[PDB]
Design a protein around this ligand. Structure first.
Ligand code: U6J
Ligand code: CL
Ligand code: CL
Ligand code: F
Ligand code: MG
Ligand code: MG
Ligand code: MG
Length: 135
């Protein structure tokens, strides 16, 4: 549970764009913990000495209950307002697990979205997460 930081003091995070298939047309979002009627891209803090790709896959399993085939690093995205820096990877989902950690613990929800709908629901409070899909 120990948070880690870059040398500028930004929190180190990792996340995946969890796609339903190699066509990358539908992505899995999860509910916000603060505001459960909102959607976010699953992700979270890198542990000490943890590789970003390992952190990304681990947080997706914890938060979204999925596993799959890790793909490319999309990019490294800074949130200046919230002082964090996130490595974002593609993950092609191959396993959808029931009763996952955040479902059991906080009633976290998950849902598939077409890319243009994911961008729409992320824009108001997670505009940097909406920018993950730009490329
Ligand atoms: O609970 P999570 O994992 O979904 O994500 C929370 C961040 O957790 P994050 O996803 O970065 O980490 P993890 O708990 O490892 O997933 C947390 O970050 P932190 O303050 O470091 O706890 C941040 O708190 P902030 O400090 O006010 O920015 C919250 O806003 C954010 O909540 P959300 O985006 O509404 O779901
Ligand atoms: Cl898809
Ligand atoms: Cl963000
Ligand atoms: F977490
Ligand atoms: Mg988490
Ligand atoms: Mg998180
Ligand atoms: Mg975490």
């Amino acid at each position: 549970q120990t948070r880690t930081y870059d040398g500028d003091g930004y929190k180190k995070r990792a996340a995946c764009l969890c796609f339903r298939s190699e066509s990358e047309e539908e992505v899995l979002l999860v509910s916000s913990s603060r505001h459960p009627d909102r959607w976010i891209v699953p992700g979270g803090g890198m542990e000490p000495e943890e590789e970003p790709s390992v952190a990304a896959v681990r947080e997706v399993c914890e938060e979204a209950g999925v596993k799959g085939t890790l793909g490319r690093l999309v990019g490294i995205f800074e949130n200046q307002e919230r002082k964090h820096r996130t490595y974002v990877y593609v993950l092609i989902v191959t396993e959808v697990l029931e009763d996952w950690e955040d479902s059991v613990n906080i009633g976290r929800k998950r849902e598939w979205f077409k890319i243009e709908d994911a961008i729409k629901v992320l824009q108001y409070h997670k505009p940097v997460q909406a920018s993950y899909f730009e490329t």
